[PDB]
Design a protein around this ligand. Structure first.
Ligand SMILES: *[C@H]1O[C@H](CO)[C@@H](O[C@H]2O[C@H](CO)[C@@H](O)[C@H](O)[C@H]2NC(C)=O)[C@H](O)[C@H]1NC(C)=O
Ligand SMILES: *[C@H]1O[C@H](CO)[C@@H](O[C@H]2O[C@H](CO)[C@@H](O)[C@H](O)[C@H]2NC(C)=O)[C@H](O)[C@H]1NC(C)=O
Ligand SMILES: [Mg+2]
Ligand SMILES: [Mg+2]
Lengths: 481, 481
């Protein structure tokens, strides 16, 4: 039968944050053990280094511009959302009869009467926050018990963060030192109900770690030895340990595929309360490797042998791989990913040779910003971001503005993953890579027409979720902790 | 009985070059397996990030300025050398009756009739090159067989590189695609003779990898998928695999302690033919973490359990640990390291709380440049280096000149290992760290008197080794390949 699937997606976590990706001070013992008994990717990517667009791509296997998920990210007042018409992974697995569930951050739209909420896009069960946890004021929230407050305040002028159960406000705001526990219990129940009914489950655990502001429950506060960002990552790692114990307990180890990855690179503007891209350059919000190249682990005892692949892979390849693996059929839409099951099961290579990267603010005159083929990556356009400010590398700062490069900038990632030495600063291998990259951009730009933007549909304060509907004064009357 | 000891010391290799320290493209399967069954350090250091001074410190357990090993490094014409009077590790183990042997780079002086060569400082056996392999012309050497030449030429105006056997020129220059093989065989014989005579051996394998220029034998050329720097590191890794097979073969696994580390950070001026410091800042020649913080593995089946320590350690601590472990007595000299055996054997903590860092060009008016206590590191002086040029971080370049900092620059390495956020840009933990660091520098600077420099004793071309003594014209007549 099709396997049970657990998909864990961390938030704003970098390529060099796990212990097993080199960090000297992180504490992530469950993830290290999951890498030690599974496949660790060195070259897995996401196509855009922001939250919404990354989350859309993972769930539909489709580049975000195809469906209007740009520019920037959605906010609480947002009129727009991932069209209902797109077929998510949960829609696909639901129809093969999976009990589907999601815990955590959705950030894929809310809408008039919550029409874009997960329960409309194929999850049977949903306990979570519908957008990032810092999108609503937090100067009064506790981030670390007993009463260490969240740092800095978060977004102002908005309803507190709502924890939701399907479409109902279960709390507003929730108590952050307790979210993990709520989420483990929801996960545990979903698994056990699925055993109960003889059916495979699909759990989508989209953690809030390690997005700003950092938080954790008391068993982690001040125990990772890397400060708040670590306490928070140690908690995500202990949630993973929990899912894994529960998989043990129900005797489901060899029947569950478990993937871990993250939506985008670190927010280095948070300084030492943000993540680390390791040897890679820059972070969140850019098309440099540090923003789009993420950690990725695939673990399935008895099906995937412990190792390290350098094959190309993308979050875009998850719907199709999982569809394949569960004998479910693919939507009748154009897809930008591929089935990676041969690579997972060790009977093949990855079919993916290229990757296309779009910036946070794309546009049809400029098209794709960077393309990777084999070991080479070309950048046609370059640009820093305020999510990546504060590091010593000036190309990452928001003062590095949009600059065009013709001839393109060319890096061989196998020797210069750090993207330091432009090879066009000659050889025949180089001229052949340049001609291929130039043609893959012109091909893609000529063939993709952007979907009309969801984010420019604007904002309506009246779409903000409220615990005490119709109350007054808005937004402070919404609440019910 | 005291264990057999193998000490492997790589050259110009960075903290993020091993596969197990995060690199995405290196191929180092034996070292990864050695980490997987042993202790991987995250915070091991060397006190100066140049070759000579690092090599002096490791062998004597003493800060290089105590014995005149500054500034810069020794050259072939150098009149000076590590005084005979210093007691090396090999001297110490010899007197407890170890069969002692060294293969590889010595760079600790040559002298009039080779008075500073290893055979005078306690090794019974020596097959190697007495200084770096690029210190003599290489435009005509082959670096990768069948006939790929070394890149760039190396040093000019000098005798070719001599391979030596005790004090005799066995070759000049040697064939670089064959060094590994010579070195494995010498190592194999030394082990097996030591079994034969019922005595513990001490092998000091100081590889030439991954110093410029890169080279390897044909089984590695073009097979690591990271280019020449990788082919070269893949060869060092396959030498490690060989030592390990040989340890197996003689049935010596649980009686041999094996340590791996490297003398100093990467030479990023070699660009993509140089190493990678990972998330750490800068490289070779600086007192930033990327120049002084090195990979370090301790492997001893049945004595050291597989893990990861974050305890402080230094190359300075090796003589005393090994002396302890072999029940040999310590020289009657002031030592700057400590016995780490409790940490190795899991019955203790490291005794080391502080580390003192000197620059490549030290002086008694300025004294130590950086000090680490617990998780904090202070920099009293900062400075870039031409060994670290070419990266995006401007503080590493040789155009960043010697700048004093009062108040000191203060970093908490557990949250900011990358040395980005000066904490003095307030708190009581901070003021207490500042006062302690300021006092550890003034204490050390007032108590260490520098030894008179060996390197300023000057140069005599006549000290250059010659295969065909008395020939003419010097230096090209020296040779005998
Ligand atoms: C809200 O929606 C779902 C689905 O209706 C709730 O559903 C589940 O709850 C019970 C068992 O866990 C059963 O009464 C329902 O059959 C079951 N539904 C399915 C399809 O499994 C759920 O409790 C709410 N979501 C969550 C967990 O918050
Ligand atoms: C040069 O010096 C050493 C020591 O004299 C040589 O010594 C070893 O060689 C033989 C066995 O390997 C024996 O004849 C000697 O007893 C032995 N010496 C010791 C003390 O072990 C050695 O071959 C030369 N160095 C090397 C290996 O190059
Ligand atoms: Mg995100
Ligand atoms: Mg060196």
């Amino acid at each position: 039968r099709p396997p049970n699937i657990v998909l864990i997606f961390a938030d704003d976590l970098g390529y060099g944050d796990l212990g097993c990706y080199g960090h000297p001070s992180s504490t992530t013992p469950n993830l290290d053990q999951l890498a030690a008994g599974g496949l660790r990717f060195t070259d897995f990517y996401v196509p855009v280094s922001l939250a919404t667009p990354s989350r859309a791509a993972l769930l539909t296997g489709r580049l975000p511009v195809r469906m209007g998920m740009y520019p920037g990210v959605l906010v609480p007042s947002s009129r727009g959302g991932l069209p209902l018409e797109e077929v998510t992974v949960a829609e696909v697995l639901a129809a093969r009869g999976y009990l589907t569930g999601m815990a955590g951050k959705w950030h894929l739209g809310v809408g008039p009467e919550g029409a874009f909420l997960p329960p409309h896009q194929g999850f049977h069960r949903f306990l979570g926050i519908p957008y990032s946890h810092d999108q609503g004021p937090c100067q009064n929230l506790t981030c670390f018990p007993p009463a260490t407050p969240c740092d800095g305040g978060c977004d102002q002028g908005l309803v507190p963060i709502p924890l939701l159960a399907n479409l109902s406000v279960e709390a507003q705001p929730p108590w952050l030192p307790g979210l993990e526990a709520r989420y483990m219990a929801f996960a545990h129940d979903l698994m056990a109900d699925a055993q109960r009914e003889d059916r495979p489950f699909f759990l989508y655990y989209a953690s809030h770690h390690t997005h700003y502001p950092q938080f954790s429950g008391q068993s982690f506060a001040e125990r990772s030895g890397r400060g708040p960002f670590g306490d928070s990552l140690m908690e995500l790692d202990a949630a993973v340990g929990t899912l894994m114990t529960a998989i043990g307990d129900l005797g489901l180890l060899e029947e569950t595929l478990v993937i871990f990855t993250a939506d985008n690179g670190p927010e280095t503007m948070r300084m030492s309360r943000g993540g680390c891209s390791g040897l890679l350059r820059c972070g969140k919000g850019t098309t440099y490797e540090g923003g789009v190249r993420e950690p990725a682990l695939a673990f399935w005892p008895g099906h995937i042998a412990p190792g390290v692949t350098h094959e190309l892979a993308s979050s875009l390849d998850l719907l199709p791989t999982l569809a394949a693996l569960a004998g479910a059929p693919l939507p009748n839409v154009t897809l930008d990913g591929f089935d990676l099951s041969p690579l997972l099961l060790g009977t093949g290579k990855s079919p993916r040779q290229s990757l296309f990267f779009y910036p946070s603010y794309p546009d049809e005159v400029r098209g794709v910003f960077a393309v990777r083929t084999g070991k080479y990556k070309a950048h046609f356009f370059t640009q820093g971001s305020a999510h990546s400010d504060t590091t010593a590398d000036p190309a990452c700062h928001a003062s590095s503005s949009l600059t065009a490069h013709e001839p393109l900038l060319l890096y061989d990632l196998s020797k210069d993953p750090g993207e330091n030495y432009n090879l066009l600063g000659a050889t025949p291998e180089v001229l052949q890579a340049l001609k291929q990259l130039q043609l893959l951009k012109a091909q893609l730009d000529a063939a993709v027409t952007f979907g009309p933007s969801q984010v420019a549909r604007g904002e309506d304060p009246a779409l903000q979720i409220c615990c005490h509907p119709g109350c007054t004064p808005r937004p402070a009357c919404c609440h019910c902790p």
